Enzyme design. Sequence first.
Site, PDB file in Angstrom:
ATOM      1  N   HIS A  86       0.843  -1.210   0.000  1.00 51.68           N
ATOM      2  CA  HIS A  86       0.000   0.000   0.000  1.00 51.68           C
ATOM      3  C   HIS A  86       0.876   1.257   0.000  1.00 51.68           C
ATOM      4  CE1 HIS A  86       0.419  -0.138   4.460  1.00 51.68           C
ATOM      5  NE2 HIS A  86      -0.310   0.956   4.607  1.00 51.68           N
TER       6      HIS A  86
ATOM      7  N   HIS B 151       1.313   3.758   2.035  1.00 48.80           N
ATOM      8  CA  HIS B 151       1.892   4.197   3.282  1.00 48.80           C
ATOM      9  C   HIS B 151       3.371   3.880   3.380  1.00 48.80           C
ATOM     10  CE1 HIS B 151      -2.294   4.199   5.332  1.00 48.80           C
ATOM     11  NE2 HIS B 151      -2.004   5.376   4.804  1.00 48.80           N
TER      12      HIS B 151
ATOM     13  N   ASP C 162       5.181   2.274   5.968  1.00 48.56           N
ATOM     14  CA  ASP C 162       5.738   1.008   6.391  1.00 48.56           C
ATOM     15  C   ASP C 162       5.934   0.104   5.184  1.00 48.56           C
ATOM     16  OD1 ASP C 162       2.975   1.752   7.507  1.00 48.56           O
ATOM     17  OD2 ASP C 162       2.605  -0.403   7.430  1.00 48.56           O
TER      18      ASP C 162
ATOM     19  N   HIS D 107      -7.847  -1.453   4.321  1.00 50.33           N
ATOM     20  CA  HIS D 107      -7.003  -0.733   5.256  1.00 50.33           C
ATOM     21  C   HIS D 107      -6.814   0.649   4.680  1.00 50.33           C
ATOM     22  CE1 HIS D 107      -4.035   0.864   7.715  1.00 50.33           C
ATOM     23  NE2 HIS D 107      -3.128   0.894   6.757  1.00 50.33           N
TER      24      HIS D 107
ATOM     25  N   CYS E 139      -0.777  -4.457   6.087  1.00 56.90           N
ATOM     26  CA  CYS E 139      -1.677  -3.800   7.014  1.00 56.90           C
ATOM     27  C   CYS E 139      -3.186  -4.070   6.814  1.00 56.90           C
ATOM     28  CB  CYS E 139      -1.385  -2.282   6.991  1.00 56.90           C
ATOM     29  SG  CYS E 139       0.334  -1.744   7.431  1.00 56.90           S
TER      30      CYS E 139
ATOM     31  N   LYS F  17      -5.681  -7.526  10.204  1.00 59.44           N
ATOM     32  CA  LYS F  17      -5.549  -6.950  11.545  1.00 59.44           C
ATOM     33  C   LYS F  17      -6.544  -7.544  12.555  1.00 59.44           C
ATOM     34  CE  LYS F  17      -3.500  -3.183  11.029  1.00 59.44           C
ATOM     35  NZ  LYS F  17      -3.064  -1.764  10.867  1.00 59.44           N
TER      36      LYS F  17
ATOM     37  N   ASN G 111      -4.852   2.085  12.248  1.00 60.32           N
ATOM     38  CA  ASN G 111      -4.984   3.396  11.645  1.00 60.32           C
ATOM     39  C   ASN G 111      -6.177   3.515  10.690  1.00 60.32           C
ATOM     40  OD1 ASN G 111      -4.468   5.904  10.427  1.00 60.32           O
ATOM     41  ND2 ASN G 111      -3.031   4.956   8.971  1.00 60.32           N
TER      42      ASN G 111
ATOM     43  N   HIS H  16       1.675  -5.793  11.536  1.00 65.63           N
ATOM     44  CA  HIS H  16       1.946  -5.444  12.933  1.00 65.63           C
ATOM     45  C   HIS H  16       1.293  -6.438  13.934  1.00 65.63           C
ATOM     46  CE1 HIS H  16       2.507  -1.678  10.574  1.00 65.63           C
ATOM     47  NE2 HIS H  16       1.253  -1.840  10.195  1.00 65.63           N
TER      48      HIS H  16
HETATM   49 ZN   LIG Z   1      -1.105   1.574   6.657  1.00 66.82          ZN
HETATM   50 ZN   LIG Z   2       0.647   0.059   8.989  1.00 65.62          ZN
END
Ligand SMILES: [Zn+2]
Ligand SMILES: [Zn+2]
Length: 220
Positions: free
Chosen positions: A76, A78, A80, A138, A157, A160, A166, A196
């Site tokens: 994605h 983002h 990370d 996400h 992500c 989850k 987030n 995570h």
């Molecule tokens: Zn993310």
């Molecule tokens: Zn993340």
Amino acid sequence: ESLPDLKIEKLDEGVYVHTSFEEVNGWGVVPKHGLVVLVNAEAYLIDTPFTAKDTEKLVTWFVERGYKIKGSISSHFHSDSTGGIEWLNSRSIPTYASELTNELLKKDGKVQATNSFSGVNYWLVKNKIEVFYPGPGHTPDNVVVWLPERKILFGGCFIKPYGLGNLGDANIEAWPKSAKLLKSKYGKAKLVVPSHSEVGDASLLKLTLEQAVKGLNESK
Ligand SMILES: [Zn+2]
Ligand SMILES: [Zn+2]
């Protein structure tokens, strides 16, 4: 000042789990798993670390053991997952991103991957690495990466179980639908690697599904 150093652990046959850290506004630091899949003497980066330093260390550690980095693919837009693209582009290493995630980076004034794909699926390497797009969740571009001959699913992500996390650029309305379609296509999962949370199995799929439906209800 004090942040854990990049960790590289072996997961299976040619699959490695890489972890980097970063201080955001959670209970402090937050770890992030990605993967290096070795095909023959060619490694591929499934998501990159948050920084160039960690992305530079990761690459060399594999180049050291005599593996050429064939490319990376980000789950994605983002950080990370896209932070080390920059470093990678200057070293002119093929970087991949979905057309929606490369659009989202652009939007954020972030460097773009040098390779895009679209559609519901893409074979990064024909019979060994597939990238699937279940639909907004996400984030609106998030993809999942499938390892055919090993039954390992990188769900970044998107996966989850314990908490959606987030909600920033989420699509809470559709997460349940995507979460459901994902449980269907790849329920044949041996392993499921979250971004995570500890590694799992087919169950992380049903978990995120309830986790997501609850999130949808929990907003109306
Ligand atoms: Zn993310
Ligand atoms: Zn993340």
